Subunit: 345 residues, 4 copies
């Protein structure tokens, strides 16, 4: 069985040959149809030995879809060959958060060493993969696998981030999206679907701002030092109802604070080591909340899939063979994938 | 009338004419002194509203759709009344007030530490009935502000949740009571002073623990691993904020309510739990001030005052700075 | 001035000549640019004498848009010439509900004799009108007065009824809109602008079904006894929400027959004595039911914002003041394709 | 093992020796307590035509127990647990939020609750289908724990649905100070600042209501509507939770509710319905019939029980006393909940 795995700290990932797994009881085995590349995957492989805590080796890929190959003893509700998507942020299933589907915010996960596929558990970047538990499988009917893998993260996360504050984004509101990459271009679209918000996109790259318009953005602003003024220029004196920073570097967060509205929100979603928002009197408008959200909930994934199934999310992808796995990650690193990269086994 | 004023930046306070409507005018029955005034009066000429300035943003009074003689309370953060926020009574978050130059009484408009006062518009008065005005004055801010901050994340504080209250001061101690009125949350109080901790218990707290280095651990030892659903920090110093960050739960909330120039929560990955939101809330909303008055009228709020005469004004202030008033401080005309 | 008025119980409205009024202190006078005919008005004029409570004569029109012509003493906030829409459900201004802008749910209006323009207070079907207080005007800017007047009732009410349960209409949800006329056709577009909901519309009339399709419905089906099974056909076993802008027993019955578990019915349309039957074994578990009234201050602000954004496409027919009475007859007969709007 | 089943339509339940059951996936509990819900004195009144739950049926949908297992772990042997009644599919949109009481796939997949189409809790032992249907109760007294699964959960959910309305100044009306209603009163007080007015038919129930925190107490029947308005001023209750559900309690609820208020019809009277239409109910006042409660809502009730925020009035009975206990419930003589201890 072929797979892409991280094997040495600071080394590139490699194509490997390792056993097809079999499902224990309660487990499901998928024949992987599509596996998404997330930029988080990079942030991991950039960890130094001291910080890295995910086991070696690790089959990569926390964006995952496939078909049911083989059931472990006593699993019901699923038939061999039903098409499914994998809910990534696995949790204990039993705590107060888990009971509401919010397994991303599971209070027990850490203690019980429950880790997401691709992030401590064997990932989706192989021909087959195991899902621990049936409730982490979401039905996707005839949905194209290539366009669906991304929904599990590039979809789920922005959706979550938005769902946190969706009551604010009524008519008149303005939402700002910073970074039109994997999560970014999907962000915009989610915002058109479930809100009346005017959407303003922000990227460093001119072609990415075109992709932004392409997928629904009302206006498109060039990133950097002119950004905040251009945004206010667009929002009138008032500012942006919310800011979804899918970059999360210090400059984009600075821009976020410089633009957000009184009683608004900033979602620091993108990860830059040691970048923070500065929330104190005089540094931010009154009542403007700031959060770093994580992935997304059970019911939220089914909502994202519902969005795809309704033809409301036009996902941008590029396909790679398994052997082009390592190559796909040099491409995401250099920034040359216009959307999400996806590895079709 | 007499009217405790602030006429030279960096000093200490004081006899003005008596103003006229044509608008509403109230015989003041009480005036709260907020720590915010001490913040306003350590403001360099630069940073710093107008002088002369009649003090007091916490005001109740009696009128000197409203009966002459009505006992009423003054909604503080005035705004345009006409934006999206103001239409929802959320005038504390009004977008146009700055640009229209609309300032609260005792904060750019003539305040409550006079004997009579003007209130610009009829909507800024909340009927208090036969509630004792001394006890009511605080409601308007020491009640309003923490009520509003507790109102922003109320649905997270169902049974089994935990709320931490940092700074059992004028505001702190009303907040503790609020949490007990409107939630089933476990309340944990924190403070530097051992007498303030006792205050905390008297008004309902489920535990009160010493502020400092041992605070984070002591809090976690009562919450278990999870931490605290909501931290409301009424001190807002960097040390209190650091504590809050170290105890909050995943999917929790931090409300930075106290003001220390240059203190901030640092919100970013590794420095705060996932899903833990932070906000600096400001003052409160119209319907919120009614809700506060409703709690008082039901006997659900036991407000600790200490009365002052129109004259004892300036002395009343130095005691606040000194940390020597147990609860609020109220000036009566 | 020229105005249309209900002058005699059970008679038709007539065009009359009455003095142009003048703002009291606190008040605004408007030069009316547009006035909306609402079916509620017909309901009102159908009332028998005993029920009828709004005084005589009464100047019709509870949907109104104009420009500021005269400020009463003490009124700031507005400049003469400003374009404004009239918030209708006037309230006391001070009560717990009013302070949140929900003057439609004011608890003191009844007691105080505070009634809406055209529904106890002289309406907007005249050359000029009086609005009692400045908070009841909402700026419209350059918005076409003809497509703006319906926002005051025909937008505001659907917007509200939808607001009450919006967290229900996530991706995957379905909403039914029964009755694609004045409110109905606007209710469709709102659902599409502010929710991911799939939208099925329902009407007796085949032209109206097209209108629904034309303004965004994902589907459109014929009202009547066959209507439920066809809605169910579209959904599978049902409908997350039903907004019934007809509110007749037959439609309500359909409504209950198709609402999802933990869904909702908004009974918006008014048929005298028609009611939902909410009780065990007659409605799914969790399915809530409410008769909403009008909408809220911020709500109207928000509806106005939707128009300005170009997300609401309002279908209208224009009438002079004299065609007033003739336009009401057209409404009763059902020959207006959208909202009838009078331009003084 | 001994158990108390309904075996003959129209006939009182009976006590029987049947085999102790075995776990599949499943989990077996030594029932430490089994609550009696007036809902059963409904199911048994069902005519042979509408009754659809199978014969014979171990009665009892409020269970609390001690844990053998199924091949499924996460719970240890002898852990104390409460049982989530309204079983669902665990896979639909409602079930992913934990809202199994609103599971859509349950009637198709023919999934029924214990005591309600599946084997009950009124026995020495019981089967539980899946883990997620077990709630840790820790060291709580099982007699007081059992009513929480239903007499607790049902009112908590009914209240949860509209809690935001119930701020300081709000008024809540509880009709029917019985099993559900007297926990209803206490929940209202723990999680809100609403002023509680209880209504019942009999003085001793009105006593019970004050005993559990009711701000005020009303004699039910015609005079109620007026008596309630005398206490709300001419404004009426923000909320009315009707644990009785008869046309008259419902009627009363319409005549007292506030503009933009809520009526929750929780009691089951066969044919009784609210009449939601213009001129018959205030603008903006919502009605619903809610069903049981959610997984996270049961963790929330347990938490309330655990912090001494609830006092659950019960009378104990043994396995043999069961049948006679229902007669009690029917004639309405139990002060709170009847609970069974094997
Ligand atoms: N919060 C979560 O639960 C979670 C989940 C998934 C991803 N993430 C993080 O979100 C980030 C985005 O992920 P992705 O997979 O979409 O990466 P990506 O490579 O697809 O995104 C790159 C995009 O961001 C733009 N960009 C880079 N720097 C910018 C700048 N300073 N200003 C404006 N735009 C800039 C790029 O030009 C490009 O359009 C990553 O850091 C990832 O780790 C977090
Ligand atoms: N956010 C707003 O819109 C707004 C409105 C009003 C007041 N405030 C602010 O809230 C803060 C408190 O207000 P107050 O008037 O009740 O003050 P107060 O002086 O009456 O209360 C101070 C309390 O805090 C305690 N304290 C000081 N430092 C502490 C620390 N390190 N750890 C624990 N306890 C500590 C003191 O022992 C005392 O009990 C002030 O900074 C004030 O400006 C903010
Ligand atoms: N709830 C409120 O506060 C509020 C506010 C404004 C208007 N209304 C009421 O709402 C209702 C709608 O008013 P409008 O002005 O939009 O009416 P309208 O005359 O403009 O629209 C009538 C539409 O309903 C359709 N219709 C009639 N019977 C039908 C049936 N059995 N099935 C499907 N469609 C049917 C007609 O075909 C027509 O398209 C009226 O009853 C009006 O009085 C209520
Ligand atoms: N909605 C749900 O999912 C659900 C769940 C559980 C129970 N229930 C139903 O709720 C109801 C109450 O259950 P219970 O076991 O607590 O009943 P109970 O017998 O334990 O209590 C009944 C109480 O209501 C009082 N009462 C009777 N008629 C009255 C009236 N006219 N006005 C005021 N009070 C009156 C009685 O005196 C008694 O105090 C039942 O109908 C039951 O089936 C519904
Ligand atoms: Zn990722
Ligand atoms: Zn968990
Ligand atoms: Zn203050
Ligand atoms: Zn404003
Ligand atoms: Zn109307
Ligand atoms: Zn009012
Ligand atoms: Zn029951
Ligand atoms: Zn289900």
């Amino acid at each position: 069985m072929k797979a892409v795995q991280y094997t040495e700290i600071g080394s590139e990932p490699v194509v490997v040959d390792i056993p097809t797994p079999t499902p224990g009881p309660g487990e499901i085995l998928l024949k992987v149809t599509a596996a998404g590349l997330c930029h988080s995957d990079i942030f991991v492989m950039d960890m130094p030995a001291a910080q890295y805590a995910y086991g070696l080796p690790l089959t990569l890929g926390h964006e995952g879809v496939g078909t049911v190959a083989e059931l472990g003893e006593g699993v019901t509700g699923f038939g061999v060959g039903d098409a499914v998507a994998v809910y990534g942020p696995w949790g204990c299933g039993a705590c107060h958060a888990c009971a509401r589907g919010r397994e991303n915010y599971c209070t027990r996960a850490a203690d019980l060493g429950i880790t997401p596929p691709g992030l401590g558990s064997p990932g989706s970047m192989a021909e087959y993969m195991i899902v621990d538990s049936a409730r982490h499988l979401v039905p996707i009917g005839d949905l194209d696998p290539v366009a669906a893998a991304p929904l599990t993260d590039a979809g789920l996360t922005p959706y979550h981030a938005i769902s946190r504050v969706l009551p604010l984004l009524g008519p008149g509101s303005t939402a700002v999206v910073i970074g039109v990459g994997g999560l970014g271009h999907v962000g915009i679209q989610i915002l058109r679907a479930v809100s009346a918000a005017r959407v303003i996109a922000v990227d460093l790259d001119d072609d990415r701002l075109a992709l932004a318009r392409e997928v629904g953005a009302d206006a498109a602003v060039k990133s950097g030092a002119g950004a905040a003024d251009a945004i206010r220029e667009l929002t009138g004196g008032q500012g942006a109802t919310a800011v979804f920073d899918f970059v999360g570097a210090q400059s984009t967060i600075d821009t976020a604070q410089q633009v957000v509205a009184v009683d608004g929100h900033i979602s620091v979603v993108g990860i830059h080591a040691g970048a923070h928002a500065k929330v104190g009197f005089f540094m931010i408008p009154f009542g403007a909340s700031v959060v770093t959200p994580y992935w997304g909930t059970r019911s939220e994934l089914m909502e994202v899939v519902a969005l795809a199934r309704a033809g409301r999310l036009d996902i941008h992808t590029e396909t790679f063979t398994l052997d082009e796995g390592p190559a796909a990650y040099r491409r995401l690193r250099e920034g040359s994938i216009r959307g999400r990269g996806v590895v079709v086994p």
